[PDB]
């Protein structure tokens, strides 16, 4: 039907600017009066860009954006920091 940008706040998308340069990041804000868009990129960096310099916009795929794979990946299986005294391999239950 039709939605406003407030629904797409926090969306990760890529944007090509009038100078044929590309930049992608997760949106944080947009001001109607000045049309000014803040993007918070996953490298812990903030960047404010005024939308008027946008030549074109596109939404990127969710996860696996840089790396290319052909698996469903139902679980993230991540263990960054926070370690316990238990180890798990493949799956806790097999042939169950």
């Amino acid at each position: 039907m039709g939605m406003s940008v407030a629904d797409f706040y926090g969306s990760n998308v890529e944007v090509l600017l009038n100078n044929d340069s590309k930049a992608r990041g997760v949106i944080t804000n947009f001001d109607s009066s000045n049309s000014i868009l803040q993007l918070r990129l996953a490298n812990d960096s903030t960047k404010s860009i005024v939308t008027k310099d946008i030549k074109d916009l596109r939404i990127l795929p969710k996860n696996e954006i840089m790396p290319k794979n052909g698996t469903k990946s139902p679980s993230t299986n991540s263990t960054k920091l926070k370690s316990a005294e238990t180890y798990s391999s493949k799956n806790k239950w097999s042939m169950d």
Partner: protein
């Protein structure tokens, strides 16, 4: 059975929606802004609801 593409899934992400975001920044677009003038109404309620 077997299909041409190994991946099918369902999800929701049409390539045409990306154009709507760039279309909004470029112009209002609205329901009509190109064909000849015609009798139409554009109500704008203060609050929108999906269920009632």
């Amino acid at each position: 059975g077997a299909t041409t593409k190994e991946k099918n899934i369902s999800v929701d992400v049409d390539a045409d929606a990306s154009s709507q975001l760039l279309s909004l920044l470029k112009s209002s677009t609205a329901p009509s802004d190109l064909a000849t003038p015609q009798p139409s109404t554009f109500p704008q309620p203060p609050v929108e609801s999906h269920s009632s």
